[PDB]
């Protein structure tokens, strides 16, 4: 099923990310916790998508750009620096 498939792909990447943190911090995650973060991340995409779409259209555009995306990360100043520094690397590519 299409969305079941996308949910499984997210769950797998989240499981990988959590395993890496778990090893780095020497702390275990329950499988229910990994599952919850997966569900959280899937829902969070809805919010990201719609926001990005509104931000592009606010600037009279139909295709989302890196400014729309940086606006999304405006919320925490640390998140802002991380997405702007990540957008400098990507630009050099």
């Amino acid at each position: 099923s299409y969305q079941q498939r996308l949910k499984a792909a997210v769950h797998y990447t989240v499981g990988c990310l959590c395993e890496e943190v778990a090893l780095d911090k020497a702390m275990q995650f329950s499988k229910q916790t990994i599952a919850a973060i997966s569900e959280l991340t899937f829902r969070q995409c809805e919010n990201f998508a719609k926001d990005l779409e509104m931000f592009a259209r606010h600037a009279k555009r139909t295709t989302i750009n890196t400014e729309d995306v940086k606006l999304l990360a405006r919320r925490s100043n640390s998140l802002l620096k991380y997405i702007t520094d990540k957008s400098e690397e990507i630009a050099q590519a």
Partner: protein, 74 residues
């Protein structure tokens, strides 16, 4: 380790209101990085919380305590 661009594209497109909406390649790479940060923040904050209450593992209870602030920061 991280998200594949194709996965992130599908995830976004699932939720756009208008079928015209598209995503630049640049933007899409940024979103890949941003999704990764979100997941790692969730995981790392979960760990801190578990440490704080001296649990043996990050269980859903510990996660649930850190989510409200997580969602505010994102």
């Amino acid at each position: 380790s991280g998200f594949r661009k194709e996965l992130v594209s599908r995830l976004l497109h699932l939720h756009f209101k208008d079928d015209k909406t598209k995503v630049s390649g640049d933007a899409l790479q940024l979103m890949v990085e941003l999704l990764k940060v979100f997941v790692v923040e969730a995981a790392v904050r979960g760990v801190r919380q578990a440490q704080a209450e001296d649990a043996l593992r990050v269980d859903v209870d510990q996660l649930e305590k850190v989510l409200p602030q997580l969602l505010l920061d994102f």
